[PDB]
Amino acid sequence: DIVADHVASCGVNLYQFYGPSGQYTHEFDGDEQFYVDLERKETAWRWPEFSKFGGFDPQGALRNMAVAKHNLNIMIKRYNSTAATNEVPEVTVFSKSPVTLGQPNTLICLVDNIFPPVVNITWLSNGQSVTEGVSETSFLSKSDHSFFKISYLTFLPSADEIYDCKVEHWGLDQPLLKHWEP
């Protein structure tokens, strides 16, 4: 165990056989600084206030994904193709701030103990899939090497609207819904 005032992940490198596919992000004290959109080859800073201006060439991540891709194939042989174990994710729903009907807020759906890093997180309003007004963090890292993801939903609390968070994962026998209402 390492004791320190602060800890940064200037290199959370993920690559998995399913896809195949990977992810590159930097973290500071547990929060996401940025991620590199691997398809568009662009650096995506999540919050321009946590983007203490210093540029990051997207190329540094593609390069690192190559090594990861190569390294995965090597380790698969070295580990006699031992498959990954689907963990059972735990979902929890809560509001950003206190709820005052007729006031703009945000519901947060935390999906913890995720593994492997493949999951579907969508919202439901009275049973209907809430297409937009949604957002998501990348797969954030955990010291036990599993991941956690956080989904957001901006909304106006009312008496005629209930909500749910739908999470689909191989570690679940069926879609799991977490309920929430004013």
Partner: peptide, 26 residues
């Protein structure tokens, strides 16, 4: 093109689709 081990890390320089490189064993 630039290879890291077995995979391409950068293939932006390939002039067109008629060019393709490989390094099956790094």
């Amino acid at each position: 093109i630039y290879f890291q081990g077995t995979g391409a890390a950068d293939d932006s320089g390939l002039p067109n689709d008629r060019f393709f490189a490989v390094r099956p064993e790094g």
